[PDB]
Amino acid sequence: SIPLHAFRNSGADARKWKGRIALLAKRGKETMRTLQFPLEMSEPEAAAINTTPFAVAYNAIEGTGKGTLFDYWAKLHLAGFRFFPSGGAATIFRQQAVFEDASWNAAFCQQSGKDWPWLVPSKLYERFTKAPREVASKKSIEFTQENVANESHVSLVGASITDKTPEDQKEFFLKMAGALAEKFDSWKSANEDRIVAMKVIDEFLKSEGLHLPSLENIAVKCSVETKPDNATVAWHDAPMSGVQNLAIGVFATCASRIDNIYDLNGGKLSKLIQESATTPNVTALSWLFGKGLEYFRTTDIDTIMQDFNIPASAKESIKPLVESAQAIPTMTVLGKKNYAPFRPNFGGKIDSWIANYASRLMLLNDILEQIEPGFELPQALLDNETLMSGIDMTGDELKELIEAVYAWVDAAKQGLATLLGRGGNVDDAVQTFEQFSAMMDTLNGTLNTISARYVRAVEMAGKDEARLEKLIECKFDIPKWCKSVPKLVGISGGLPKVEEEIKVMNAAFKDVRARMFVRFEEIAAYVASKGAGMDVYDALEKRELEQIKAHIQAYRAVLHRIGRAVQNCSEKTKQLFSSKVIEMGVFKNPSHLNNFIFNQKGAIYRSPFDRSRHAPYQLHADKLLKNDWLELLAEISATLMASESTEQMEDALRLERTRLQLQLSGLPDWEYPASLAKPDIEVEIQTALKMQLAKDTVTSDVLQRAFNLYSSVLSGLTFKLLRRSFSLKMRFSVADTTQLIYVPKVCDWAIPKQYLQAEGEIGIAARVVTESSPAKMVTEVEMKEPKALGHFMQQAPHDWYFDASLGGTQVAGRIVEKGKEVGKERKLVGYRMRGNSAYKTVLDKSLVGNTELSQCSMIIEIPYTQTVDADFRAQVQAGLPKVSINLPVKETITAMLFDRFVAIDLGERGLGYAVFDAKTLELQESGHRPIKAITNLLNRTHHYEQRPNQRQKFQAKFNVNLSELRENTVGDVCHQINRICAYYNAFPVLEYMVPDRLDKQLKSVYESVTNRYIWSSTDAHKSARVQFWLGGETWEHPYLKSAKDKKPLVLSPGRGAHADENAAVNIGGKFIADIE
RNA sequence: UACCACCCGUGCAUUUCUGGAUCGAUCCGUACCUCAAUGUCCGGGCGCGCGACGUUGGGUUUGAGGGGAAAUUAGGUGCGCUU
DNA sequence: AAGCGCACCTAATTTCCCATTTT
DNA sequence: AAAATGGG
């Protein structure tokens, strides 16, 4: 019928097509997706929003410093407070002495011969503490022999009674449960009669003839109340004193409780500390972030010591906890009085860290155990002048470095034990791994320098035997363990303080530039005192001293460093400079001049150490020597002095540092006083340079490299000063069910009259409607026909408002909350939710039950612009805050893919396809579909791949989000494969690897598309694939069988394997040959 | 299947309701973010001020995509200096 | 070609996005 | 509506 160009698999329909392929899935999950609704605010309303209280609350919830919840949470874990899921659970733990679990259980195991460790007295006083709940398939809460036996077996042994379960276990509960079922009418009644229930089980055990101690007696002792009411925490462990690293200490405290930690993997360790740290579903955090936060903040230290029965010894470890409690500010936003509603994302953050840190501890253990002792460097190499030059240390300091690395592998093995809870100072083990990583970085750097120098010396020596023989005798191989040591995982959060940041970078830029000019004058003063010259042309007799391991190179090295500065300047500057050089006519080709100056390609000077094969740019020598190149730099700088454009200002600062440094590159070969190389600015110094620096005298290279630190901090500050726009995004999620305000429109509605002739819910409602207004209409439907309300409300004129606790419009509305009957018209306050019909159809489907709204996230985004003045001082300006609701939604699929397959080739301009019958594996149709989004991505990212010096400026200058542009292009290619799949009722067959001939931006796209159809081991790929196919993870073809295992094919729902059309027919051939 | 015609970037204007309910009709849903398309501005390139060169070249969908948020780690790229 | 110092851009890890019932 | 926590 219609051709493929006319076929429409898009929008709500592609989501129905996929909902259906998903229902064909062998295995799969339920997915969510967020829909963002901007809240409508007038400019008056947006101006009236105060973001200061929102900033205070977000910094307490998300900050990892003082006054935050990470600091109250960590200091609870470090004071000796174990966390428990309920309060009941904590009271039983605080009564472990009374129970005598071990003793009782051992006696039962011996007397009965049953050997049932799970039957301890404590697990029984529990089942009579907690009643079960009719989870809604619904459970039942009535006390029956069947009910109680199942509930008691689940609590004690952790599983429901099944046929597989040994009969002895089943009978033991049945007989007990039978006694309990006879004696107690209800779980409610049994829970009240704790002592009586224990007596009953004691009688059951005595009837069976066991001489075990009285549980009833235990119950009387256990029946006193633990003072802090409903506490989910119990003090027990000794306190970890003065841990600067808060999270790393909490992980160690928790891991200390685990036994045989080394056998465990990252997943297992993560799950056992996640349970002890945040507790399952952060149920403990409810109390600590609610009534617990009040207790610690508002109880005499003496009564927090009495109520948890803490020894006087730990008082100094508890004194800090109360300060950390008291420091978190009052919760004043989203109508919330305390922090408990914010627990779900606090848990997610900590649990994320715990999982990532536990994997990193387990990695460092494997790395530390592969460091093989005995690596040594040949004595020859340690005495080849050439291959030990430029490492800032002698051969007797590289020997000592390799010895230092082996000693630090032993200290690192003990630091890891201390971090996995085995014992020690945690803060002196973080330091060990730092000092270990630093030593191993210095060794890896030094050996990369020496191996590079070696392969350069070999090539240059060439055929000369004396050179080659002495070189090959210095040969060494870098050991596999000599690598960057992976760091310990950190944790941070809170808002960037914009006004403070700007103050800091303005202060820093002015101070560093002052200190750089000051030092250069001090160096020039000292060289003047001894009467010598900073002759930059003579100092390139150094080109000679390195060459052994002249004038042409001296003048080419001053014109290549001057030239490379212009390459990083504006087109104004690039022209002013370029013309002057063309007048001189130094270059054989002026094409090469502008190629170098404008296209940033090639060079007019190469260092001898450079392994590059491309010859420097040809020049006429006479012109080069005739003209002073340092003179040009003064002239260009002078032209760009008074421009007052920020782009020209930045060139002025770059060329200033180029002039200062080409003068310092001309210093005579001497020994300098070592205070002419000591930096007063804050910068990282490599440890080789810093041990070279802590001496009486330094070489010219040390003087020069320490001065380049001035320039590297200035160039850094420039990236932060030249930021033009950014936003402060604050996200808040409570643990409360999403409530939407359904506001009927204040307009006359003429209900369609065909609605009366229908047997549906809309029919039922349309029949009973007599009133004019849609607010009065919905009241009339509610009162007369209440089952049909929902369907009538979806059609009746309405708006959607949200009560962010920020004010808004007073509206007459009915609250629409999940698993609740719609509210009665109350007067309410809310901000209208902006959105097209496609988004609002998802809110209307919720009234019927076709969709479920989840707990939402409110996002306050505050926009900012930044500008630099004449003095290059940055200024920031904040716009009106935008508020939005990010609503996670779940949606039901209403109740083809196997009988054909389509091979898809991703090519340069679009895709090709070839469809075969899955039954007969024959060719039925082929075609090519140009995608214009591929051509647009290669056109708008051309100057990010061919102008390398300008990739940190391509986004702000060209107003692009390359991530978003790649997201749109993956959007548009997946759309076209999904459209072809839908049009021919075919499952997609893709090649496994994106070719390496393709542009870097297209390779990225073509690999975010192969990973939504083909299977990938990487979790990120599987997560993306499943969310794309609406929870569908695995599919199984009914009749197609793999050659490899003679198993039915697994699809996802694709299978890994004109030019694009030709290629797809070949991908399809490859797939067929891999099936029976 | 008729249609359309140098290419790219930047800025400006314009378009972009794309979802439901009932039996084409009636009613509900006000339309966010991004990509695009349409015209215009200036700059660059190519050919002969002007541009498709039988023809390809392109387009055809109800234009298309929209799962957020937070922390983390690792890698890559750039600039400068030294050997 | 390497090394270092300072930047920015990208890709992957891990977690959250309860419900039930009492008070 | 807020607090506590069951049921995996």
Residue A1050 sits at φ, ψ, to 5 deg, of -100, 130
CB A440 within 8 A of CB A485: yes
A90: nt with nearest C1' to CA: D5
* DSSP run (H or E) holding A929: strand A923-930
The rounded distance, in Å, linking the Cα atoms of A1058 and A977 is 17
DSSP string, A453-507: HHHHHHHHHTT-HHHHHHHHTT-----TT-SPPPPPP----S---HHHHHHHHHH
A338: nt with nearest C1' to CA: D2
Neighbours of A370 (CB within 10 A): 11
A561: nt with nearest C1' to CA: B80
Q: Which residues, listed in sequence order, are joined to residue A886 by a DSSP beta bridge?
A: A36, A857
CB A735 within 8 A of CB A855: yes
Three-state secondary-structure class, residue A1012: helix
A1017: nt with nearest C1' to CA: C12
The rounded distance, in Å, linking the Cα atoms of A363 and A266 is 9
The rounded distance, in Å, linking the Cα atoms of A711 and A654 is 9
Please name which of A618, A643, A623, A537 lies closest in space to residue A580, comparing C-alpha atoms. A623
A600 Cβ neighbours under 8 A, 6+ residues apart: A567, A947, A948, A949
A149 Cβ neighbours under 8 A, 6+ residues apart: A161, A170, A173, A174, A176, A177, A178
Residue ranges covered by each domain of chain A: 4-24+896-1073, 65-85+232-343, 89-222, 369-472, 501-725, 732-891
Q: Give the residue carrying structure tokens 């077996």.
A: A153
Q: Measured from the CB, is A274 under 7 Å from any atom of strand C?
A: yes
Q: Measured from the CB, is A136 under 7 Å from any atom of strand D?
A: no
Q: Measured from the CB, is A441 under 7 Å from any atom of strand C?
A: yes
Three-state secondary-structure class, residue A587: strand
Q: Which of residues 641-700 of A touch strand C (CB under 7 A)?
A: 683-686
Q: Which of residues 27-46 of A touch strand B (CB under 7 A)?
A: 31-36, 38, 40
In whole angstroms, B50 C1' to A937 CA is 30
In whole angstroms, B43 C1' to A464 CA is 56
The rounded distance, in Å, linking the Cα atoms of A1069 and A1063 is 10
Residue A878: alpha-carbon gap to chain centroid: 27
**Residue closest to sugar C1' of B70 by CA:** A349
Q: Measured from the CB, is A573 under 7 Å from any atom of strand D?
A: no
Please name which of A756, A757, A776 lies closest in space to residue A766, comparing C-alpha atoms. A756
A1007 Cβ neighbours under 8 A, 6+ residues apart: A994
In whole angstroms, C5 C1' to A707 CA is 11
In whole angstroms, B29 C1' to A345 CA is 34
Q: Measured from the CB, is A1011 under 7 Å from any atom of strand B?
A: no
Q: Measured from the CB, is A230 under 7 Å from any atom of strand D?
A: yes
Q: Measured from the CB, is A1012 under 7 Å from any atom of strand C?
A: no
Which positions on strand B lie below 7 Å from a protein C-beta? 1, 8-11, 17-23, 25-32, 34-37, 57-75, 77-83
The rounded distance, in Å, linking the Cα atoms of A765 and A759 is 10
**Residue closest to sugar C1' of B78 by CA:** A949
The rounded distance, in Å, linking the Cα atoms of A414 and A21 is 54
Q: Measured from the CB, is A260 under 7 Å from any atom of strand B?
A: no
A31: nt with nearest C1' to CA: B67
A692 Cβ neighbours under 8 A, 6+ residues apart: A392, A698, A702
Measured CA angle at A203 (ends A198, A207), to 5 deg: 150
CA atoms within 13 A on the CB side of A294: 11
Exposed e or buried b for every residue in A37-48, given b needs 16+ CB within 10 A? bbbbbeeebeee
In whole angstroms, B37 C1' to A733 CA is 39
Which positions on strand D lie below 7 Å from a protein C-beta? 1-8
A969 Cβ neighbours under 8 A, 6+ residues apart: A931, A933, A934, A936, A937, A1005
A736: nt with nearest C1' to CA: C18
Q: Measured from the CB, is A268 under 7 Å from any atom of strand C?
A: no
Residue type, A526: Y
Q: Measured from the CB, is A1066 under 7 Å from any atom of strand C?
A: no
CB A52 within 8 A of CB A495: no
Q: Measured from the CB, is A754 under 7 Å from any atom of strand B?
A: yes
Q: What does each C-alpha distance from A57 to A391, A425, A730, A755, A934 come to in angstroms? A: 51, 34, 10, 50, 44
CB A828 within 8 A of CB A808: no
Please name which of A501, A637, A623 lies closest in space to residue A576, comparing C-alpha atoms. A637
**Residue closest to sugar C1' of C21 by CA:** A133
Count Cβ atoms within 10 A of the Cβ of residue A446 and give its class: 0-12 exposed, 13-18 middle, 19 or more buried. buried
In whole angstroms, C7 C1' to A952 CA is 8
State the method: cryo-EM
Q: Measured from the CB, is A1000 under 7 Å from any atom of strand C?
A: no
Task: State this model's resolution in angstroms.
Answer: 2.7
Count Cβ atoms within 10 A of the Cβ of residue A963 and give its class: 0-12 exposed, 13-18 middle, 19 or more buried. exposed
**Residue closest to sugar C1' of B76 by CA:** A1000
In whole angstroms, B56 C1' to A753 CA is 57
Q: Measured from the CB, is A484 under 7 Å from any atom of strand C?
A: no
Measured CA angle at A543 (ends A555, A447), to 5 deg: 135
Please name which of A623, A558, A614, A618 lies closest in space to residue A584, comparing C-alpha atoms. A623
The rounded distance, in Å, linking the Cα atoms of A682 and A679 is 8
Q: Measured from the CB, is A795 under 7 Å from any atom of strand D?
A: no
A525 Cβ neighbours under 8 A, 6+ residues apart: none
